[PDB]
Amino acid sequence: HCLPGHYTPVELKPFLDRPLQDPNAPGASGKAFKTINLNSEEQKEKQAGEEKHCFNAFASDRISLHRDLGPDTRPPECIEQKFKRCPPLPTTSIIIVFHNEAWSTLLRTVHSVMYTSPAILLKEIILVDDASVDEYLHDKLDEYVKQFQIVKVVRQKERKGLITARLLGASVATGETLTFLDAHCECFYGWLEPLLARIAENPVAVVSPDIASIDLNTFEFSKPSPYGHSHNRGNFDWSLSFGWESLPKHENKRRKDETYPIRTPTFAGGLFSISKDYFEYIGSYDEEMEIWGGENIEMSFRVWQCGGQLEIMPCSVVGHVFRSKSPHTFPKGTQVITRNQVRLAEVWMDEYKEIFYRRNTEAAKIVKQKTFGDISKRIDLRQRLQCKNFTWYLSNVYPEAYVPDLNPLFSGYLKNIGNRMCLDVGENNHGGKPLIMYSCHGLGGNQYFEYSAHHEIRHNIQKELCLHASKGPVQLRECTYKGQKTFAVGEEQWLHQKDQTLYNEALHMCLTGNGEHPSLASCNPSDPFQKWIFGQN
């Protein structure tokens, strides 16, 4: 089965040949489509699309299903890379899960895969319908897709969400590998070979493309740059949200060219390839997780702790329509996401789970009322595979991570006697911006604060941020205290006094909850707006 040499370009020719495109058509070569100067019926269609899909479906419906993405702008070593015939490139089953996807976006995903994926690799495309309502996604889709011969639609009759749908897809797949894609993606040139070649080399590797943004408003594709730019890897924050960060210096040094894998603490988890056998062996997904949320983080910890590796291959580029809001209904509310996170925290995070429970009150409650369900199959899997503990994961996989204290001196919320609202970090804050007052919700999150031995008031979900005194509005800034060497600057040291005032040690002034932004004022023990409760949840 194992031949000498490298696959030829003829051996790699795609399943379907892209027709030469009209260069002046809308969205051509992946450039912006500006949908402006619309008549009254058109402006109606656009708002209907935006509100159905939480992307500009009006734009998507006017762009070819066949659009090229212009010239291949990947690094030169990616365009030149050859693939050995031994071990052979494995076959793949493409699994696209959808729930009420637009036609234009679902079929541009399917067309993209056929135009960019070598015929010799592409065994089948499985479309998993998670109980879509739209009639066009029933018989119309079944019939349209027959022409392609290798495309099958599988139906999840009752809405069970993305996790159950992927397990359904996997159970019918016969490929040697599974490649998962969302239903609003577009494959770049040569995206598949580098994923599948890496699994051929190392079958415990779970590999992701370097995911590109497709703009939800204009459908512009963010193209790779040829000169070794800043890459992102996946992380988690201590609310267990997926996030992106710069690579550390040791990884830049280790990677000699762009064909080298990037080791990633977490993966976005929509777009990746895996050995089918390894997917099953390493515990596929927790079947009790519902709708959306947590499974990518759960899979990240489980792969790493149980002896696999999570990798991003920058020679593999796939565009994704990133949204700001879900279009999806939640049959039994968004509590589902928090239950999914408690399930992964109980199984994988050991003592570190308490750091998350403190920051998401809803999760602390689910633990206390034991409504997160039976995890005995997940516990059993962690034992049978002899997976390492979370201390090992933080040390060996994510040594760069800020880890809060397991048992901080104090955590909770800051409630103002005067106006009966809570100190809130606001919608968007990672440096610089003033804070707000917001209704006390007791949920933690944006109202979460810790008190340190060194008199700091921390907001430490993502970064180690410290309440930072100023002549005007109070800020969150990076703590200057970060262990052995360093100290705590007076602008970040506070005393909660007997009169319930918050007294900054540097400025000798008191936090008031008056105005839009809490600021420092002359200390007035009779001012209710300078009186703070440090409430525990």
Binding site: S239, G243, F322, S326
Partner: peptide
């Protein structure tokens, strides 16, 4: 009263 970071239920872009 937002129940999470604004409009969660989506993966953030890079």
């Amino acid at each position: 009263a937002t129940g999470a970071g604004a409009g969660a239920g989506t993966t953030p872009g890079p």
